[PDB]
Amino acid sequence: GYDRHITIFSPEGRLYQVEYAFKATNQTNINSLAVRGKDCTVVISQKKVPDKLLDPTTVSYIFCISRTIGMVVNGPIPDARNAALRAKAEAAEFRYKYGYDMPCDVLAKRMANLSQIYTQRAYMRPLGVILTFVSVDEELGPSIYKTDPAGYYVGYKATATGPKQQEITTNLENHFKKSKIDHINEESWEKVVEFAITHMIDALGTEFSKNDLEVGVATKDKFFTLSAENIEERLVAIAEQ
Amino acid sequence: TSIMAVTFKDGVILGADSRTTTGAYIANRVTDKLTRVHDKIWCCRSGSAADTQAIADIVQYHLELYTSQYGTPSTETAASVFKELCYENKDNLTAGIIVAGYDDKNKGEVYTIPLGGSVHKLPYAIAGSGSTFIYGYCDKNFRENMSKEETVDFIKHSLSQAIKWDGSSGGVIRMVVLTAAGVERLIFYPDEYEQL
Amino acid sequence: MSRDAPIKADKDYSQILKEEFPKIDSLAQNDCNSALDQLLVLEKKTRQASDLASSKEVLAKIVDLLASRNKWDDLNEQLTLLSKKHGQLKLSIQYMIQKVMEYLKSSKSLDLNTRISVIETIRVVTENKIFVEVERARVTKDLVEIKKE
Amino acid sequence: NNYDGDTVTFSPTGRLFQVEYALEAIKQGSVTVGLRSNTHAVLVALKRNADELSSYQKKIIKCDEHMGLSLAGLAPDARVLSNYLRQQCNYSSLVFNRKLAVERAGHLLCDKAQKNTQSYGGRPYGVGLLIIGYDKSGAHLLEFQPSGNVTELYGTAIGARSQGAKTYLERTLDTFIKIDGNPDELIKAGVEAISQSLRDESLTVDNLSIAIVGKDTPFTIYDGEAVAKYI
Amino acid sequence: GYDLSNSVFSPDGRNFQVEYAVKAVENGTTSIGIKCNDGVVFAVEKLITSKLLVPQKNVKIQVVDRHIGCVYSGLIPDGRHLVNRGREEAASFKKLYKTPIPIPAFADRLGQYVQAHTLYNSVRPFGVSTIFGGVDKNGAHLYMLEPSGSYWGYKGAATGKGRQSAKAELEKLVDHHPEGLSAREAVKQAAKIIYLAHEDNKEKDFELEISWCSLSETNGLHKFVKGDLLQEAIDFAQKEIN
Amino acid sequence: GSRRYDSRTTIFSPEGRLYQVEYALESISHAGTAIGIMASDGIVLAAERKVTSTLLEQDTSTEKLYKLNDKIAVAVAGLTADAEILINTARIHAQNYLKTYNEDIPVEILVRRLSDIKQGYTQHGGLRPFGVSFIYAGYDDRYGYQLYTSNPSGNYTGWKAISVGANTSAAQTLLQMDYKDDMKVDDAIELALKTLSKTTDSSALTYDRLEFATIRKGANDGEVYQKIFKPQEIKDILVKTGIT
Amino acid sequence: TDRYSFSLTTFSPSGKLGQIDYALTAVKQGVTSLGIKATNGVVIATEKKSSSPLAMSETLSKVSLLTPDIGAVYSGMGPDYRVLVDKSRKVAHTSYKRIYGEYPPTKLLVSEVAKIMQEATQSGGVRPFGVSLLIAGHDEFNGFSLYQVDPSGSYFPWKATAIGKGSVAAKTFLEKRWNDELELEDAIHIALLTLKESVEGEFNGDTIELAIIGDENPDLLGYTGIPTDKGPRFRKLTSQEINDRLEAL
Structure with a gap:
């Protein structure tokens, strides 16, 4: 029928046209991960340059x-x-x-x-x-907060996105079950960036570069982005832990 | 009301009073006119209170969007928005705005916007009602490229004469310093510039 | 990459510092980290092929730490610092670990000295299992042989 | 009825099919041929009566004394474009105290058709124009497709059996460009060009309609016993 | 089904009307853009369908602003309309902020616009890819804009029938200069790879056009290439392919 | 497209008949019955609900009966939801007449207006009509008591007694056989209840399933007093007529 | 252009407006929510479901305030309710806070909201919303009221009702527990007990949203010292308190 081509209900009460909108975000092969630090929120995400x-x-x-x-x-x-x-x-x-x-x-x-x-x-x-x-x-x-095509939104302790985001989600859930609070404790936002990278590498099974990542940090009253050099600094600190 | 801004070596210093009259009654004498529309470009209000505040809000709204899509505004860029709204209310609104800012694209800049709306670059700018009596002192005593201390004291001295000759300028003198060293708010109490 | 300049540039430095190899080897006796810092910059690149090439240079350099009986303590540390950072994908430090086993045998170094460096290595290789295995059993067996006696 | 009943739907061939159909109006339609030198431009149009008790239909529209357009396709579609070009040309005289340029009037026209083919329920216009004119740049002769795209030539044709007319103009190409200051020669050569487009549609002295524009000549349409100076 | 509008969506996660529009430009002209250090050099193949045409009169290179070059391929009337809108945008920015629009800013705005016509069944999408760039105080920029509304940073870009032929050479050109290269030298390059992408257009003949925006020669304005410089480039490309 | 998702719903059929109107009459036969009878002392409006549930409150439900003005009320048969909009339009049209002429609106005018809106939906806009049938109790000074029935097409027809909603056939005939023109409010009160008990969608008619209302001229001076009865007074009158 | 002004609600060839029937189906795909009316209060309750275990149900609102003395709760689609509650608030303010000044009667407001439902089944470019609302409230005129707004655009007063996927079972549950006289406390126990059978997850008081339109409470107004004026009769119960209630079933 033609309740799947325009946004009108079916005999199930379902909008199929809307559901399809979710199915297209896997086609760019971009994952993101975002966690709340102690005084910051870090989001690390893939950058595809083919x-x-x-x-x-x-x-x-x-x-x-x-x-x-x-x-x-x-x-x-x-x-x-x-x-x-x-x-x-x-x-x-x-x-x-x-x-x-x-x-x-x-x-x-x-x-x-x-x-x-x-x-x-x-x-x-x-x-x-x-x-x-x-x-x-x-x-x-x-x-x-993660909003979605349907127009549903809900707050978030942490979140992931991408075709492979179940794995990422599994990791994060287990961490907050050991720690028993809804945000990572540390006290230097830099080390929350480092932690986020470690979980991402575990989840997707691949170590990333300074141009496979692009990193954004919100501290108090500000948002900025890390340059590709700053990211390489973090990957040395993986060694240092 | 009097406002001025003056360029110097390493950046720009903005200077204002804090007295606001309507008629013979002073409405408040500690209201800051130094206004922030970007972290690094501030501006100065004078004349009718409502008109300038209204325009300042509009410009902040527009500059926010500029930052989030295209990168930060320059001092120039900012002056134009003030200018062009004054051009659209040139028969209605009487506003004196000085837009001054410190960039790394252009180091310190002073632009000024009249009632009818035109932008004018100057190495120093004065505007208001009371700052026209200090005009001659300004140009005779001005120097190009002074020290930080020399600029602070020049603005202090100019506005002392302003408060002298104008009852609408009074209260504290407020200054903002824009630089690559930080942003320095300064305040001078009346006894401190009455000694001089 | 999206540019070819880092692939070439690190290769120029490697050719040079492999014919400066004798100058570097004598300098390790005076202080090995001062000679070593120069080689470490090469492995701070994101080019896995040329970092594999520059681990050949390090492997020659560090024989002198082994002959020394004071400086091999900091080799153990150096391995850590490279493995956890990247390990230059995992390839660079794999080559290092593979070629050290053969050297320990010809040096005939002290029993204490040989175990504690190999003990530190068997820690490193645990996290992978995708191909490290082939080497990994040989690494553990060198501890085994001494402890039989 | 997927892509041929809508005017909003692509087409993995990178088309809109409607435009091809609108170009078939030109095959069924009349024929007109334009050619220019560097000093004059000329249109030669084949007029066609509805029957023999009918006057033959005029196919050339004067847009200004430096500009004219001619149709080969549907007349009601041509009625929109004739109005539009006159409007813009008069606007240029009013505002800039200028003639309007030939290239530029083609560009305005192109983007006009485009946003009526964009809008769903619209149509692409099925009439092809030859737009001639004389401006500062000299003569110009544009071919206007139903797509809307404009092309600059020294000689061009459209309509039924326009292919043979371009053969003819490509052969005499270096002849009529190196004739200057005589519009007469061009007209004679244009008659020969549209005779490569006949199908027993004959050329008479009341079938032939000529229009020229010069540097010293206004836009003038010759008809009657005054086209028999070039026969 | 799912091929009758631009606001159906398939269970595959694909919009075919929009994808299909890229094929329109695939039957267009070959056009290339070399991202330099000082600027950008565009070149466009102009097909010759007869010899009645007047070469370098049929413009595909329109300037937008006094410093942004734009050259497009695909369905021609459509692309001329896309540039039409963008000139209005240029004037608006100048009016409000009193400075010419930046190169990234212009890229942004066009993306919004091409987005709009794939969100409604009441307007028709475009059928062009456009290549544009220039110099501003943030540096030289190069962008290619799909009819989907997608753009990215580009070291080098191409489109048209011979986009494959072009792009293969651009990879080797980053091997020749991994530090990027000068605009002035890239003029000769620009010709070279249109001749190489005319080996997919080897049952036709062509006219070469070249345009540049570079800070080291033209003072950061977008101008045309013509005269003595042009014929040097034409001669270069000939001898190489011969 | 946009003509691609419209099949044309509000054209005529080949019998000259609007698709949407014909479907509407069927959907109003799904909805509960409402009967109007005109006595020579009044008009009785009596309505049976289309919903009755496990724990539905029907003791205050004023969901079929609405006062349009203090002399005109309606009984509703069809979608309650659909009916809402026209109910409040009617309130506005009535008050407007009072505001500008200083007089209460005739029954004729008010109904004719609402019918026009219904006709207007299929006339323009592509819009569907509300699937509603109304029975109007109204008093004016020119035709006295007037009774009207209106349909989703937008046409009005007078009656002496009429029925809408579920089981119109059965109800209509019984009303014809039993109604006399010299009946009172008392007689009509009893006649309506008996007719609704032959058309009850359960097997019994109950006081909380009845909405019952009158417009009576027994109020002094010949004034019309509209009364929507309390649930205890409906129960009161239902035992009197001997159903329960 | 604008060629979508043909209604997307139509009739079926078998009668019965098909679009609002589909919209009523979406409520049976929705969450369960219920309202029990007492004779000295009203209680409304719903379950919180999220698509993530990292989601916050502390910034998730399925029971929302319209005016101090009136609350609403849905079953059906989330997005639909999110815009619809804003329109309910907006008409209540523009037509009864700028015209009649005070907080409306419950009966009034229910009628007004049903008109917006109606006007999404008339026009083109709009199909109706697919939630059902329970609007519980108290006015000092018609007393306590509990109403149910349909996706058809009608309203009904109920004695006790449920909406959601477990509505049919729930009204059967309420038949035997219900009595014409109830206390507010007892109502809380009945409400949560019925909703425990209409949830197939785990039933916590951290994941169950409870609200009463029961006792006034003055200190939630924002001021004190005039007792002729009160604060909200709506009062949302915090989580720890609800846990106490799980023991009181």
């Missing part, structure tokens, strides 16, 4: 929405830039009319509504990207 003729410095899956909130995207790159733009406009919007920078929580909720609106029309294609927003807020503390 050629020389692609310049690696430009291949970015990390878009700064706010000064304080980073966004890492898993899935097709057109929809990524589209989603980034909407989110950037809305963050600025709220700063203008409410006199402070938009909460991470409220931004996640916002994109969830817009996602629902793209599945409310019957000629609009859902934005298939899965979005991770990472922040350190001053009211909610360290935060991860």
Whole structure:
């Protein structure tokens, strides 16, 4: 039938058109992992550069929405830039009319509504990207919120994305069962980066380089990105543990 | 109200009063007019309070989005947004804005925006009501490329005369220093520049 | 890579410091880390092929640490520092570990000295099992032979 | 009825099929041939009556005294483009005190058709234009496809049996460019070019319609017993 | 099924209307872009379908701003409209911020735009890949934009029928200079690999066009290549393929 | 596309008949019965719910009966949900008449308006009509008591007694055989209950499944007092007529 | 363009508006939630499900506030409810806080929200939302009320009801436990006991969301010293308290 081609219910009450949107984020072979540190939130993610003729410095899956909130995207790159733009406009919007920078929580909720609106029309294609927003807020503390094509969102202790993300998830769950708290204790954010890399290497079974990773760090009142050199520093510190 | 900013060697220092009049009643005398629209480009408000605050909010909204997509704004870039909103309300809004900032694309810069909206680069800028009486002192005593201390004392001296001759300029003198050494807020209490 | 300059550049340095090999070997007697730091920079690259090539240079250099009876304590440490960092995928330090076993035999070094370096190695190789095995049993057997007597 | 009933759907052949169908209007349609030197441009159009008790239909539209267009396909589609070009040309005179340039008017037209083929429910226009004109750059002769794309030539044709006319113009190509200052010669050669496009459609003195533009000549349409100066 | 709009989606995770649009450019002209240190050098193959045409009159190279070169391949009217929108964007930025738009900024904006027409059944996607770049205060940049709305950083890029022929040579060119290379020398290169990608267009004949934006010669503006420099490049490429 | 996902729902059929309207009448026969009878002293509106559940509260359910204004009420038969929108449109149209003319709206005008909206849905916009049938109790000063029935097509027809909802055939005939033109409110109160017990979708008619309402001219001076009875008063009158 | 202004709700050739029937199916794919009406309060309860074990159910809200004295809870689709609760709040404010000033009657507000459901079954480019809401509340006029809003755009008052995948079993459960007179405490026990049978996971008080529209509580208003004015009759029970309640079943 044609309840699978436009976003109208079936005799099960299911929107098949929407479900397909999830099925496309595995096609770029990008994984991400994001954990809440002690005073930071770190997200490490794969960077695929299949050629020389692609310049690696430009291949970015990390878009700064706010000064304080980073966004890492898993899935097709057109929809990524589209989603980034909407989110950037809305963050600025709220700063203008409410006199402070938009909460991470409220931004996640916002994109969830817009996602629902793209599945409310019957000629609009859902934005298939899965979005991770990472922040350190001053009211909610360290935060991860992952929104999805359907327009469902929920908070997160930690999260992973990609075709191979079950393995990553298994690792993280076991860690927080030994530690019995919802965020990694350490006290230098640098060592939380190092820890995150170790779990990733275990999960995907591959050691990464400084151009197989791209790393984003949110500390208090800020988000920035590590350069490829900083990442190589971390991989020496794997030796040092 | 008087505002000024003056370039020096290593960056730029912004200087303002904190007294705001409407009529003969002083509404408040400790309101800071030094406003942050980027970490590194600040600006100075003078004239009618509402007009300048409104425009300043709009510009911050636009510059935020600039950073998150295209990279940080330059001092130039920022001045234009103030300018162009004043050009769209040139028959309605009377605003004196000085936009000054320290870049590494351009070291220190002073741009100023009149009521009707034009941008003007100057090695020093003055604007307001009370800063027109200190105008002649400004140019006769100005020096190109001074020491940090020399700049701090120049702004202190200019605004002392301003407070002298204008009852709408008063309170504390507030300064922000923009540099590659940090960002230094300074405050001078009245006895401290009355000695001089 | 996306550029060819690191593949070449590290190879220029390696050719040079392999014909500077005698100058380096005498310098280890005075202080081995001062001679060694230069060789370590080569293995800070992300080019696994040329790091495999530069472990051949290190293997010659460190024979003198073995003949020394003071400096082989810091060889044990050096192996750690390279293995946990990368081990330059896992290839570089595999070559090092493989070729040390043969050297221990011809040197006929002291029993204490030979065990504690090989003891530190059998720790390193445990985490892998994908091909290290072939070497791995030989590594453990050298401890075994002495302890039979 | 997958890709041929919609005007919004690709096509792994990198087409829109509708455009090909709109180009078949030219095969069934009339024929017109343009050729230029460096100092004059000329259109020779084959007019066609509906029957013998009908006056023959004019196929050349004057857009300005430095510009003209001619159709070979559907007339109602041509009615939109004639209005549009006149509007933009008058706009150029008003605003920039300029003639409008030949290349540039083609570019405006191209992107116009494109966004009506983009919009679902629309149509690609099925009329092909030859756009001639004389501007500062000299003469220009553009071929306008139903795609909308514009091409610059010294001589071109479209319509039914346009292929033979390009053979003819490629052979006389170096002849009529090195004639300058005489529009007459070009017209004679253009008659010969569209005679390679007949199918017993004959050329008479009331079938033949000529239009020229020069540096010293306005846009002028010759018809009547005044096209029999070139026969 | 799933081939009647651009807001169906398949269980495979694929949008075919959008993928199909890349094939449109695959039947387009060969166009290359060499990312240099000082700038960028574009070159585009112009097919000659007759000898009635007037060479170097049929433009595919349009300048957007005073410093961003744009050259496109695929369905021509579509690409001219894509450039049409981008000129409006250039003026808007200049109006508000009083400075010419940056190279990365322009890339961003076009990506949004091409995104929009694959999200509605009421507008039709484009059928072009565009190659554009330039010099700004962040350096030289090169980008290729798919009709899907995808772009990346590019050491070298190509598209058209002979994109394979082009890209194979660009790999070797990074072997020749792993430090990148000068814009001035890349002009001669640019011709070379269009001649090599005309061996897939070897039942036709071609006209070579070259355009450059480089900071070391043209003061960072986008200009055309013409005259004496042009014919030096044409001669170079000939002798090599002969 | 956009014409690719529309098969054309609101055109005529080859008998001159709107697909959507014909389907609507069937869906209103699914919904509970509602009967209207006009006495020469009043109008009785009586409605049976289309839902009755395990623990449904029906003691305060005012889900079929709505006062449009203080002389016009409706009984609802069809989708309760669909009906909502037109119920409040009707309130607005009525109050507007009072606001500008200083007079209560005639029954004729109010119904004719709502019918126009229904007609308007298939006339323009591609929109479906609300699947509703209304029975209007209304008083005016020009035709006195007026009784109307309206259908999802947008047409009004007068009646002396009429039935909508489930089992219209059976109900209609019994009403014709038993109704006389000299009946009172008392007589009509009993006649409605007997007709609803031949069309009850359970095997018994219960007081909490009945909504019952009158408009009576026994209120002084000839004024019309609308009364929607309390659940204890419906139970009260149902034992009187001897069903329970 | 805009060519989607043809309704996406239609009838079937066998009667019965097909779209809202499908939307009613999505509620049977949804979570279970229930409301028991007492004669001195109302209790509403729902279960929290997440797609991750690292997900926070501490920033997950399935019971939400509309006005101090009125609460809502759904069964069905999450996304649908997330936008719909905002529209409920918005009409309540624009039509009864800027016009009538005070917090609306329960009966009023239920009608108003059902109109939005109705207006998603009329127009093109919109199909209806596929949740059912229980809106529990108290007004001082019509007393305690518990209502159920349909995905059809109708409302019904209930004595006790459930919605979700286990609704049919739940109303059978409530038949024997229900009585015309209840205390609020006893209601809590009945509500959670029915929902324990409609959850097939583990049944905690950390993963069970409990709220009462029972006793007033003044200190949750934000001020004290005028007792003629109170604070919220809604009161969400924290987790540790719910654990105490698991023992009280």
